[PDB]
Amino acid sequence: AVGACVLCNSQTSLRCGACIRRPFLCCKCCYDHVISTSHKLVLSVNPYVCNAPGCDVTDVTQLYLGGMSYYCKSHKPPISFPLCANGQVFGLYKVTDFNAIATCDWTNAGDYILANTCTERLKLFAAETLKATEETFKLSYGIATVREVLSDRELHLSWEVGKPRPPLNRNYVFTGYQIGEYTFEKDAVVYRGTTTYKLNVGDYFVLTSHTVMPLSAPTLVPQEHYVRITGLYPTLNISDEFSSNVANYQKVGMQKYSTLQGPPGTGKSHFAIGLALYYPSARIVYTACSHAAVDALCEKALKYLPIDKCSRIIPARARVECFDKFKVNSTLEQYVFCTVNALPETTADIVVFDEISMATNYDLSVVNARLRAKHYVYIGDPAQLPAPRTLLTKGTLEPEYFNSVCRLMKTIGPDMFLGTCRRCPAEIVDTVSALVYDNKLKAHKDKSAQCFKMFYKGVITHDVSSAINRPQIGVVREFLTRNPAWRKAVFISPYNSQNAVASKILGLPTQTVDSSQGSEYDYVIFTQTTETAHSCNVNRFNVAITRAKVGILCIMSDRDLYDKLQFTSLEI
Ligand SMILES: [Zn+2]
Ligand SMILES: [Zn+2]
Ligand SMILES: [Zn+2]
């Protein structure tokens, strides 16, 4: 019960017993916390509570020291000192921002802004408080019991009364009862389990609420700048392919951490795997939050890096299918590809953390705690989608507030920027360049003349809260008949309920804007569905239209984004 202060690093026995994370607060900070918040319980070796029998005075301001013990104003002896006096709380070794992180419910945007504008220890305290609050909210949801089993991918459920029912989408992973993790998609619902088990009636599903471990290491290590490349040994025969990134790989060896903003199709995976060919002796650990991002880096490594020094680290609780071409769990290989929550405690010459807009400060901290590296590279784009903040309902989270790396890329600018998009038809590049990249993204491709936009509001129906626009899918059906080349298109929309109606009516493979991130397709059909804050989000809009390599059809609901699309307008 003895440690350092989460606000000034001063030594103390004092911890706030009212905080969901029990932080150590020094005498001056602990006082300035209990006197300006509803939090009045202070802990140390023993709690500051009235020692008198059957007494329930736990407020530190209403307590005193009578000998080696604590009592209130109604039980204390004549020789008693108040615990709260002269701006200090009595303890061994004798804040506005901390107060707000300790007392917020994490439902407002300003809560997340503060958790990123504060000092580094307050960023870790906010990351811990938030993740603990997010897990205690998963308990509030009601247990889902199987009522009947229709087929191999279809069923009907019985929900717990009183306790709210969580939204059925692949974004929420249940745990059957330990009959494997299971996911759902909306009376004929779709059942998709990580494990093959003959669906039983009576067996129930609960969201796996994991325990939040304390955060020790910072979100970003202190920056160091070097005059020479440190601990890394470059080649003077880096292939013509990676020559465009030589000036940037050198910047990587001359700084502790480096930020890289890579708009869609500008060469992020190419840069990441190219850093290994530039310092061919270095041990590189490739990390990302999702299994999909770690697998997309594995695919690029399979093409250039020797498959013998490559290892895909798969966690024992293998949830959904990942990369199978590398030696599994060989922690000691030169190239280690592994998701953040599966990272073993190891060291590296370079750590590459990809899809940095999806990282939370909790993830940023975990990577710094599990990996000790000479150099750290953060690759991503604050103009793309962040990690879902499940408690956030009021206000929108701006990219400078996604995490500490994003905050740097949006305030001081990124260290490195890949400015030429080699995937998208010029119409898409020119639209996203003006929308989110302040006209600095350039098109390598020509205009494809296969980019269309249609202003059709349709009719919005709601499957609980996930939206459907059957008339916008009707327009896509009409278009598909006159444009058979578009038969091979991927259907994208901001809602999975729209994607379910579109999969049955169009037969096109379906993907939400959020699951499309990181992937590319020749043709993309996007229906906006609604003109809500969710479907008008410019980061979602940017990810949606930048998936196409050849053509895109956008059926729009919002006049603003329809007008901003530099596409050929269509009629019907
Ligand atoms: Zn302090
Ligand atoms: Zn507190
Ligand atoms: Zn008392």
Coordinates of C-alpha atoms and ligand atoms in Angstrom, one line a residue:
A1 CA 0.0 0.0 0.0
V2 CA 3.0 2.4 -0.7
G3 CA 3.6 4.0 -4.1
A4 CA 4.0 7.2 -6.2
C5 CA 1.4 9.9 -6.8
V6 CA -0.5 9.9 -10.2
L7 CA -0.4 13.7 -10.3
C8 CA 3.1 14.8 -9.2
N9 CA 5.1 11.5 -8.6
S10 CA 5.5 12.4 -4.8
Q11 CA 5.7 9.3 -2.5
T12 CA 2.4 8.5 -0.5
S13 CA 0.5 5.7 1.3
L14 CA -2.8 7.7 0.2
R15 CA -5.1 6.1 -2.5
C16 CA -8.6 7.4 -3.4
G17 CA -11.0 4.6 -2.4
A18 CA -13.8 6.3 -4.4
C19 CA -11.9 6.0 -7.8
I20 CA -12.7 2.8 -9.9
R21 CA -8.9 2.5 -10.2
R22 CA -7.6 3.4 -6.6
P23 CA -4.9 5.9 -7.6
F24 CA -2.1 7.0 -5.3
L25 CA -2.5 10.7 -4.5
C26 CA 0.0 12.7 -2.4
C27 CA -1.2 14.8 0.6
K28 CA -1.7 18.0 -1.4
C29 CA -3.3 16.3 -4.5
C30 CA -5.5 14.0 -2.4
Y31 CA -6.8 17.0 -0.5
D32 CA -7.5 19.0 -3.7
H33 CA -9.3 15.9 -5.0
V34 CA -11.6 15.1 -1.9
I35 CA -12.5 18.8 -1.5
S36 CA -13.6 19.4 -5.1
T37 CA -15.2 16.0 -6.0
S38 CA -18.0 13.7 -4.4
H39 CA -15.0 11.3 -3.7
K40 CA -14.4 11.4 0.0
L41 CA -13.0 7.9 0.8
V42 CA -9.2 8.0 1.3
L43 CA -7.2 4.7 1.8
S44 CA -3.5 4.0 3.1
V45 CA -2.3 1.1 5.2
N46 CA -5.8 1.2 6.9
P47 CA -8.8 3.2 5.5
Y48 CA -9.6 6.6 6.7
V49 CA -12.9 5.6 8.3
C50 CA -14.3 6.2 11.9
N51 CA -12.9 3.5 14.2
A52 CA -15.7 4.0 16.7
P53 CA -18.1 0.9 16.7
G54 CA -21.1 1.0 14.4
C55 CA -20.1 4.4 13.0
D56 CA -20.4 5.1 9.3
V57 CA -18.5 8.4 8.8
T58 CA -16.2 7.6 5.8
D59 CA -15.7 11.2 4.5
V60 CA -12.0 12.2 5.1
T61 CA -13.1 15.9 5.7
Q62 CA -15.3 14.7 8.6
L63 CA -12.4 12.7 10.2
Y64 CA -9.6 13.3 12.7
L65 CA -6.4 11.5 14.2
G66 CA -6.8 10.4 17.9
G67 CA -3.7 8.5 18.8
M68 CA -2.7 6.2 15.9
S69 CA -6.5 5.8 15.0
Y70 CA -9.2 7.9 13.1
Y71 CA -12.6 9.2 14.4
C72 CA -15.3 11.7 13.4
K73 CA -16.4 15.0 15.2
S74 CA -18.8 12.9 17.4
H75 CA -16.3 10.2 18.5
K76 CA -12.8 11.8 18.5
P77 CA -10.8 12.5 21.7
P78 CA -9.9 16.1 23.0
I79 CA -6.3 15.6 21.4
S80 CA -7.4 15.1 17.8
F81 CA -6.0 16.7 14.6
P82 CA -8.3 17.0 11.4
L83 CA -7.2 14.7 8.6
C84 CA -8.1 17.6 6.2
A85 CA -6.2 20.8 7.0
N86 CA -3.8 23.4 5.5
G87 CA -4.4 22.0 2.0
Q88 CA -3.2 18.5 2.8
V89 CA -4.8 15.1 3.8
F90 CA -2.8 13.5 6.7
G91 CA -0.6 10.7 5.4
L92 CA 3.0 9.4 5.3
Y93 CA 5.7 11.6 3.7
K94 CA 3.8 15.0 4.1
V95 CA -5.8 18.6 -10.3
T96 CA -8.8 20.1 -12.2
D97 CA -8.1 17.7 -15.1
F98 CA -7.7 14.6 -12.8
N99 CA -11.0 15.4 -11.0
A100 CA -12.9 15.2 -14.4
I101 CA -11.2 11.9 -15.5
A102 CA -12.0 10.3 -12.0
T103 CA -15.7 11.4 -12.0
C104 CA -16.9 11.1 -15.6
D105 CA -19.1 8.3 -17.0
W106 CA -17.2 8.3 -20.5
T107 CA -20.4 9.0 -22.4
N108 CA -19.4 12.5 -23.6
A109 CA -16.8 13.5 -26.2
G110 CA -15.2 16.0 -23.9
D111 CA -14.2 13.0 -21.6
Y112 CA -12.0 11.6 -24.4
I113 CA -10.6 15.0 -25.4
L114 CA -9.4 15.5 -21.8
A115 CA -8.0 11.9 -21.6
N116 CA -5.6 13.0 -24.4
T117 CA -4.9 16.7 -23.7
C118 CA -3.8 15.9 -20.1
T119 CA -0.2 14.9 -18.8
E120 CA 1.2 11.5 -19.6
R121 CA 0.3 9.9 -16.1
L122 CA -3.3 11.3 -16.5
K123 CA -3.5 9.7 -20.0
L124 CA -2.7 6.2 -18.4
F125 CA -5.1 6.9 -15.5
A126 CA -7.8 7.9 -18.0
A127 CA -7.0 4.8 -20.2
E128 CA -7.4 2.5 -17.2
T129 CA -10.5 4.2 -15.8
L130 CA -12.2 4.1 -19.3
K131 CA -11.3 0.4 -20.0
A132 CA -12.6 -0.6 -16.5
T133 CA -15.8 1.5 -17.0
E134 CA -16.3 -0.2 -20.5
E135 CA -16.0 -3.7 -18.9
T136 CA -18.4 -3.0 -15.9
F137 CA -20.9 -1.8 -18.6
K138 CA -20.7 -5.2 -20.4
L139 CA -22.3 -6.7 -17.2
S140 CA -25.4 -4.4 -17.6
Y141 CA -26.5 -6.3 -20.7
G142 CA -29.0 -9.3 -20.4
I143 CA -28.0 -13.0 -20.8
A144 CA -29.1 -14.5 -24.2
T145 CA -30.5 -18.1 -24.0
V146 CA -31.1 -20.3 -27.1
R147 CA -34.8 -20.9 -27.6
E148 CA -34.7 -22.9 -30.9
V149 CA -32.2 -24.0 -33.7
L150 CA -33.4 -23.8 -37.3
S151 CA -30.3 -24.6 -39.3
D152 CA -26.4 -24.3 -39.3
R153 CA -26.4 -20.4 -39.6
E154 CA -29.9 -19.4 -38.5
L155 CA -31.7 -19.3 -34.9
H156 CA -34.2 -17.5 -32.5
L157 CA -33.3 -16.3 -29.0
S158 CA -34.8 -15.7 -25.4
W159 CA -33.5 -12.4 -23.7
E160 CA -33.2 -11.6 -20.0
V161 CA -36.0 -9.3 -18.8
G162 CA -35.2 -5.8 -17.3
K163 CA -31.5 -5.8 -18.4
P164 CA -31.0 -4.1 -21.8
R165 CA -30.4 -6.2 -25.0
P166 CA -27.0 -5.3 -26.8
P167 CA -26.8 -4.6 -30.6
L168 CA -26.5 -7.7 -32.7
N169 CA -23.5 -7.2 -35.0
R170 CA -20.0 -8.8 -35.4
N171 CA -18.7 -5.8 -33.3
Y172 CA -20.1 -7.5 -30.1
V173 CA -18.5 -11.0 -29.3
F174 CA -20.5 -13.3 -26.9
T175 CA -19.2 -16.4 -25.0
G176 CA -21.5 -19.4 -25.1
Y177 CA -22.0 -21.8 -22.1
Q178 CA -17.4 -22.5 -22.6
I179 CA -18.8 -23.6 -26.0
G180 CA -16.6 -21.0 -27.8
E181 CA -17.0 -17.3 -28.7
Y182 CA -20.1 -16.6 -30.8
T183 CA -21.2 -13.5 -32.9
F184 CA -24.8 -12.5 -34.3
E185 CA -26.4 -10.7 -37.3
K186 CA -30.1 -9.5 -37.5
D187 CA -37.1 -13.0 -36.5
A188 CA -34.5 -15.1 -38.5
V189 CA -31.1 -14.0 -37.0
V190 CA -27.7 -15.4 -38.1
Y191 CA -25.5 -17.5 -35.6
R192 CA -21.7 -17.5 -36.3
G193 CA -19.5 -19.2 -33.8
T194 CA -15.7 -19.3 -33.6
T195 CA -16.0 -23.0 -32.8
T196 CA -18.1 -25.7 -34.5
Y197 CA -20.6 -27.0 -32.0
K198 CA -24.1 -28.4 -32.6
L199 CA -26.2 -25.4 -31.3
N200 CA -28.1 -26.5 -28.1
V201 CA -31.3 -25.0 -26.7
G202 CA -30.8 -23.7 -23.1
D203 CA -27.1 -22.9 -23.5
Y204 CA -26.7 -19.1 -23.0
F205 CA -24.3 -16.3 -24.3
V206 CA -22.5 -13.6 -22.3
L207 CA -20.1 -10.8 -23.5
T208 CA -16.6 -11.7 -22.1
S209 CA -15.8 -8.8 -19.8
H210 CA -12.0 -9.1 -19.2
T211 CA -10.2 -7.7 -16.2
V212 CA -8.4 -4.3 -16.8
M213 CA -4.7 -4.6 -15.9
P214 CA -2.9 -1.5 -14.6
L215 CA -0.9 0.6 -17.0
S216 CA 2.8 1.1 -16.2
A217 CA 4.6 2.3 -19.4
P218 CA 3.6 5.6 -21.2
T219 CA 1.5 5.8 -24.4
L220 CA 4.6 7.3 -26.1
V221 CA 8.1 6.9 -24.8
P222 CA 10.1 10.2 -24.3
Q223 CA 11.3 11.3 -27.8
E224 CA 15.0 11.0 -28.5
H225 CA 16.7 12.5 -31.6
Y226 CA 20.0 11.1 -32.9
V227 CA 22.7 12.5 -35.2
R228 CA 23.5 9.0 -36.7
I229 CA 21.4 5.9 -37.3
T230 CA 21.4 4.1 -33.9
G231 CA 21.7 0.3 -33.4
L232 CA 20.5 -0.4 -37.0
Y233 CA 22.7 -1.4 -39.9
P234 CA 21.5 -0.2 -43.4
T235 CA 22.2 -1.8 -46.8
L236 CA 23.6 0.1 -49.8
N237 CA 21.6 -2.2 -52.1
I238 CA 18.0 -1.5 -51.1
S239 CA 16.0 -2.5 -54.3
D240 CA 14.6 0.3 -56.7
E241 CA 11.1 -0.8 -55.3
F242 CA 11.9 0.7 -51.8
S243 CA 14.1 3.6 -53.0
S244 CA 11.3 6.1 -52.5
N245 CA 11.3 5.4 -48.8
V246 CA 15.2 5.5 -48.2
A247 CA 15.1 9.1 -46.8
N248 CA 12.2 8.1 -44.5
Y249 CA 13.9 4.8 -43.2
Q250 CA 16.9 6.9 -42.2
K251 CA 14.6 9.3 -40.2
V252 CA 13.4 6.0 -38.5
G253 CA 17.0 5.2 -37.3
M254 CA 17.6 8.8 -36.1
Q255 CA 14.6 9.1 -33.7
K256 CA 13.2 6.9 -30.8
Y257 CA 9.7 7.1 -32.2
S258 CA 8.5 8.1 -35.7
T259 CA 4.9 8.9 -37.0
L260 CA 3.8 8.0 -40.5
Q261 CA 0.6 9.3 -42.1
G262 CA -0.4 7.1 -44.9
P263 CA -3.7 7.9 -46.7
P264 CA -5.4 5.0 -48.5
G265 CA -3.2 3.1 -51.0
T266 CA -0.1 5.4 -50.5
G267 CA 2.3 2.6 -49.5
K268 CA 2.0 1.9 -45.8
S269 CA 2.5 -2.0 -45.9
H270 CA 5.2 -1.4 -48.5
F271 CA 7.0 1.1 -46.2
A272 CA 6.6 -1.2 -43.2
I273 CA 8.0 -4.4 -44.9
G274 CA 10.6 -2.2 -46.7
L275 CA 12.1 -1.0 -43.4
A276 CA 13.1 -4.7 -42.9
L277 CA 14.9 -4.8 -46.3
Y278 CA 16.6 -1.5 -45.5
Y279 CA 17.9 -2.7 -42.0
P280 CA 18.2 -6.4 -42.9
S281 CA 19.9 -7.4 -39.6
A282 CA 17.4 -5.8 -37.3
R283 CA 14.7 -7.7 -35.4
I284 CA 11.3 -6.3 -36.3
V285 CA 8.1 -6.9 -34.3
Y286 CA 5.0 -6.0 -36.4
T287 CA 2.0 -5.2 -34.2
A288 CA -1.6 -3.9 -34.7
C289 CA -4.9 -4.1 -32.8
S290 CA -6.7 -6.4 -35.2
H291 CA -5.9 -9.9 -36.5
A292 CA -6.8 -8.5 -40.0
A293 CA -4.1 -5.8 -39.8
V294 CA -1.4 -8.2 -38.6
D295 CA -2.4 -10.6 -41.4
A296 CA -2.2 -7.8 -44.1
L297 CA 1.4 -7.1 -42.9
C298 CA 2.1 -10.9 -43.0
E299 CA 0.9 -11.0 -46.6
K300 CA 3.3 -8.2 -47.6
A301 CA 6.2 -9.9 -45.6
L302 CA 5.5 -13.2 -47.3
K303 CA 6.4 -11.5 -50.7
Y304 CA 9.7 -9.8 -49.7
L305 CA 11.1 -11.2 -46.3
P306 CA 12.5 -14.7 -45.9
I307 CA 9.6 -17.0 -44.7
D308 CA 12.1 -18.9 -42.4
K309 CA 12.6 -15.9 -40.1
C310 CA 8.9 -15.2 -40.0
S311 CA 6.5 -16.0 -37.1
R312 CA 2.8 -15.4 -36.7
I313 CA 2.1 -15.3 -32.9
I314 CA -1.4 -16.9 -32.4
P315 CA -3.0 -16.5 -28.9
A316 CA -4.0 -19.9 -27.2
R317 CA -7.7 -18.7 -27.2
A318 CA -7.8 -18.6 -31.0
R319 CA -11.0 -16.5 -31.7
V320 CA -11.4 -15.9 -35.5
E321 CA -9.1 -17.4 -38.3
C322 CA -5.7 -15.7 -38.9
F323 CA -2.4 -16.1 -41.0
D324 CA -1.3 -19.8 -41.6
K325 CA 1.9 -19.5 -43.8
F326 CA 4.5 -18.7 -41.0
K327 CA 5.8 -20.8 -38.1
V328 CA 3.3 -20.3 -35.2
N329 CA 4.4 -18.9 -31.8
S330 CA 8.1 -19.0 -32.5
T331 CA 8.6 -15.8 -30.3
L332 CA 12.4 -15.8 -31.1
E333 CA 12.2 -15.3 -34.9
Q334 CA 13.6 -12.1 -36.6
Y335 CA 10.2 -11.2 -37.9
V336 CA 7.4 -11.5 -35.4
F337 CA 3.8 -10.6 -36.4
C338 CA 1.4 -10.4 -33.5
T339 CA -1.7 -8.5 -32.3
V340 CA -1.3 -6.0 -29.3
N341 CA -3.3 -8.2 -26.7
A342 CA -1.2 -11.3 -27.7
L343 CA 2.3 -9.6 -27.5
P344 CA 4.9 -11.6 -25.5
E345 CA 7.3 -9.8 -23.2
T346 CA 10.2 -9.3 -25.6
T347 CA 12.7 -6.8 -27.1
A348 CA 13.3 -5.7 -30.7
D349 CA 15.6 -3.4 -32.8
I350 CA 12.4 -1.9 -34.4
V351 CA 8.7 -2.2 -33.4
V352 CA 6.2 -1.3 -36.3
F353 CA 2.7 -0.5 -34.9
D354 CA 0.3 -0.4 -37.9
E355 CA -3.3 1.0 -38.2
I356 CA -2.6 3.6 -35.6
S357 CA -6.0 5.4 -35.8
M358 CA -7.5 2.1 -34.4
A359 CA -5.2 2.1 -31.3
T360 CA -6.5 3.4 -28.0
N361 CA -4.1 4.9 -25.4
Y362 CA -4.6 1.6 -23.4
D363 CA -3.1 -0.2 -26.5
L364 CA -0.3 2.4 -26.9
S365 CA 0.7 1.8 -23.3
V366 CA 0.5 -2.1 -23.5
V367 CA 2.9 -2.1 -26.5
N368 CA 5.4 0.1 -24.6
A369 CA 5.1 -2.3 -21.5
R370 CA 5.4 -5.6 -23.5
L371 CA 8.1 -4.5 -26.1
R372 CA 11.4 -2.8 -25.3
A373 CA 12.8 -1.4 -28.6
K374 CA 15.6 0.8 -30.0
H375 CA 13.1 2.3 -32.5
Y376 CA 9.3 2.5 -32.7
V377 CA 7.3 3.3 -35.9
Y378 CA 3.6 4.3 -35.8
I379 CA 2.0 3.8 -39.2
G380 CA -1.6 4.9 -39.9
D381 CA -3.9 7.8 -40.8
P382 CA -5.9 10.1 -38.4
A383 CA -8.2 10.7 -41.5
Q384 CA -9.4 7.0 -41.2
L385 CA -11.6 5.2 -38.6
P386 CA -10.8 5.0 -34.9
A387 CA -11.4 2.2 -32.4
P388 CA -15.1 2.1 -31.4
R389 CA -15.8 3.9 -28.1
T390 CA -18.8 1.9 -26.9
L391 CA -19.6 4.2 -23.9
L392 CA -19.5 7.4 -26.1
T393 CA -23.0 8.6 -27.1
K394 CA -22.8 12.4 -26.7
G395 CA -20.6 14.4 -29.2
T396 CA -18.2 13.3 -31.9
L397 CA -14.6 12.3 -31.3
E398 CA -12.2 14.3 -33.5
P399 CA -9.0 12.6 -35.0
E400 CA -6.7 14.6 -32.8
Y401 CA -8.3 12.9 -29.8
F402 CA -8.2 9.2 -31.1
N403 CA -4.9 8.5 -29.3
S404 CA -1.5 10.1 -28.5
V405 CA 0.0 9.3 -31.9
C406 CA -3.0 10.7 -33.7
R407 CA -2.9 13.8 -31.5
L408 CA 0.8 14.3 -32.7
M409 CA -0.1 13.7 -36.4
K410 CA -2.9 16.3 -36.2
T411 CA -1.2 19.1 -34.1
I412 CA 2.6 19.1 -35.0
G413 CA 2.1 17.0 -38.2
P414 CA 3.4 13.6 -39.0
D415 CA 7.2 12.9 -39.3
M416 CA 6.6 11.1 -42.6
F417 CA 3.7 11.4 -45.1
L418 CA 3.0 9.1 -48.1
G419 CA 1.5 11.7 -50.6
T420 CA 0.8 9.7 -53.7
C421 CA -2.3 7.4 -53.8
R422 CA -1.6 4.4 -56.2
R423 CA -5.0 2.6 -55.7
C424 CA -7.8 5.0 -56.4
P425 CA -9.2 6.5 -59.6
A426 CA -8.4 10.2 -59.6
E427 CA -12.1 11.2 -58.9
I428 CA -11.9 9.4 -55.5
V429 CA -8.3 10.8 -54.7
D430 CA -9.3 14.4 -55.6
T431 CA -12.4 14.1 -53.4
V432 CA -10.6 12.7 -50.3
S433 CA -7.6 15.0 -50.8
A434 CA -9.9 18.1 -50.5
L435 CA -12.2 16.5 -47.8
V436 CA -9.6 15.2 -45.2
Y437 CA -6.0 15.8 -46.5
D438 CA -6.0 19.6 -47.1
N439 CA -5.3 19.0 -50.8
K440 CA -2.0 17.2 -50.2
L441 CA -3.0 13.7 -51.4
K442 CA -2.1 13.2 -55.1
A443 CA -3.5 10.7 -57.7
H444 CA -1.1 8.3 -59.4
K445 CA -4.0 6.8 -61.3
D446 CA -5.9 8.6 -64.0
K447 CA -9.7 9.3 -63.7
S448 CA -11.3 5.9 -64.4
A449 CA -14.7 7.5 -65.5
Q450 CA -16.4 4.7 -63.5
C451 CA -17.1 6.8 -60.5
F452 CA -20.8 7.7 -60.1
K453 CA -22.9 9.5 -57.5
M454 CA -26.6 9.6 -57.1
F455 CA -28.7 11.8 -54.8
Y456 CA -31.5 9.5 -53.6
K457 CA -32.9 9.9 -50.0
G458 CA -35.1 6.7 -50.4
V459 CA -36.9 5.5 -47.2
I460 CA -35.2 4.8 -43.9
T461 CA -36.4 1.9 -41.9
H462 CA -34.8 0.8 -38.6
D463 CA -33.9 -2.8 -37.4
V464 CA -33.8 -1.7 -33.8
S465 CA -31.2 1.2 -34.5
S466 CA -29.1 -0.2 -37.4
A467 CA -30.6 1.4 -40.5
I468 CA -32.1 0.1 -43.8
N469 CA -32.9 1.9 -47.0
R470 CA -34.6 -0.6 -49.4
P471 CA -35.2 2.1 -52.1
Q472 CA -31.4 2.8 -52.2
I473 CA -30.8 -1.0 -52.7
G474 CA -33.6 -0.9 -55.4
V475 CA -31.6 1.8 -57.2
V476 CA -28.5 -0.4 -57.0
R477 CA -30.5 -3.4 -58.5
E478 CA -31.6 -1.1 -61.4
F479 CA -28.1 0.1 -62.0
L480 CA -26.6 -3.5 -61.9
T481 CA -28.9 -4.6 -64.7
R482 CA -27.7 -1.8 -67.0
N483 CA -24.0 -2.2 -65.8
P484 CA -23.1 -5.9 -65.7
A485 CA -19.4 -5.2 -65.1
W486 CA -20.5 -4.1 -61.6
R487 CA -21.6 -7.7 -60.9
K488 CA -18.1 -8.2 -59.2
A489 CA -18.6 -5.1 -56.9
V490 CA -18.5 -5.2 -53.1
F491 CA -21.5 -3.6 -51.4
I492 CA -20.5 -1.2 -48.6
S493 CA -22.7 0.9 -46.2
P494 CA -22.4 2.4 -42.7
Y495 CA -25.0 -0.2 -41.3
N496 CA -24.9 -4.1 -41.1
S497 CA -28.8 -4.2 -41.4
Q498 CA -28.5 -2.4 -44.8
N499 CA -25.8 -4.9 -45.7
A500 CA -28.1 -7.9 -44.8
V501 CA -31.0 -6.5 -46.9
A502 CA -28.5 -5.8 -49.8
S503 CA -26.9 -9.3 -49.6
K504 CA -30.2 -11.0 -50.0
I505 CA -31.5 -8.6 -52.8
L506 CA -28.3 -8.0 -54.7
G507 CA -26.2 -11.1 -53.9
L508 CA -23.0 -8.9 -53.8
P509 CA -20.5 -9.5 -51.0
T510 CA -21.2 -7.1 -48.2
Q511 CA -18.9 -5.1 -45.9
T512 CA -19.5 -2.2 -43.4
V513 CA -17.3 1.0 -43.9
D514 CA -15.5 0.0 -40.6
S515 CA -14.7 -3.6 -41.8
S516 CA -13.7 -2.4 -45.3
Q517 CA -10.8 -0.3 -43.8
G518 CA -7.5 -1.7 -45.0
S519 CA -9.0 -3.6 -47.9
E520 CA -9.4 -2.7 -51.6
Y521 CA -11.8 -3.9 -54.3
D522 CA -12.0 -3.2 -58.1
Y523 CA -15.6 -2.0 -57.8
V524 CA -17.4 -0.6 -54.8
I525 CA -21.2 0.1 -54.4
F526 CA -21.9 2.4 -51.4
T527 CA -25.3 3.3 -50.2
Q528 CA -25.2 6.0 -47.4
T529 CA -28.5 4.7 -46.0
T530 CA -29.2 7.7 -43.7
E531 CA -28.0 11.3 -43.2
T532 CA -27.0 10.7 -39.5
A533 CA -23.8 11.8 -37.7
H534 CA -22.5 8.2 -38.2
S535 CA -23.1 8.1 -42.0
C536 CA -21.9 11.7 -42.5
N537 CA -18.6 11.2 -40.6
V538 CA -15.9 12.4 -42.9
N539 CA -13.4 9.7 -41.7
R540 CA -16.0 7.0 -42.5
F541 CA -16.9 8.7 -45.8
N542 CA -13.1 8.8 -46.7
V543 CA -12.6 5.1 -45.9
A544 CA -15.8 4.1 -47.8
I545 CA -14.9 5.8 -51.1
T546 CA -11.1 5.0 -51.0
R547 CA -11.8 1.2 -51.1
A548 CA -12.2 1.2 -55.0
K549 CA -9.4 0.6 -57.4
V550 CA -11.5 1.0 -60.6
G551 CA -15.0 2.3 -59.9
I552 CA -17.4 3.4 -57.3
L553 CA -21.2 4.0 -57.3
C554 CA -22.3 6.2 -54.3
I555 CA -26.1 6.4 -53.6
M556 CA -26.1 9.5 -51.2
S557 CA -28.5 10.8 -48.6
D558 CA -26.5 13.9 -47.5
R559 CA -26.5 16.8 -50.0
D560 CA -23.2 18.1 -48.4
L561 CA -21.1 15.0 -49.1
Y562 CA -23.0 14.3 -52.4
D563 CA -21.9 17.8 -53.7
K564 CA -18.3 17.2 -52.4
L565 CA -18.1 13.9 -54.4
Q566 CA -16.1 14.7 -57.7
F567 CA -18.0 11.9 -59.5
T568 CA -20.2 11.8 -62.6
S569 CA -23.8 12.4 -61.4
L570 CA -26.5 9.7 -62.4
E571 CA -30.3 9.8 -63.0
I572 CA -33.5 7.7 -62.2
Ligands
ZN1 ZN 0.5 15.1 -6.0
ZN2 ZN -11.2 9.8 -6.6
ZN3 ZN -17.7 8.4 14.6

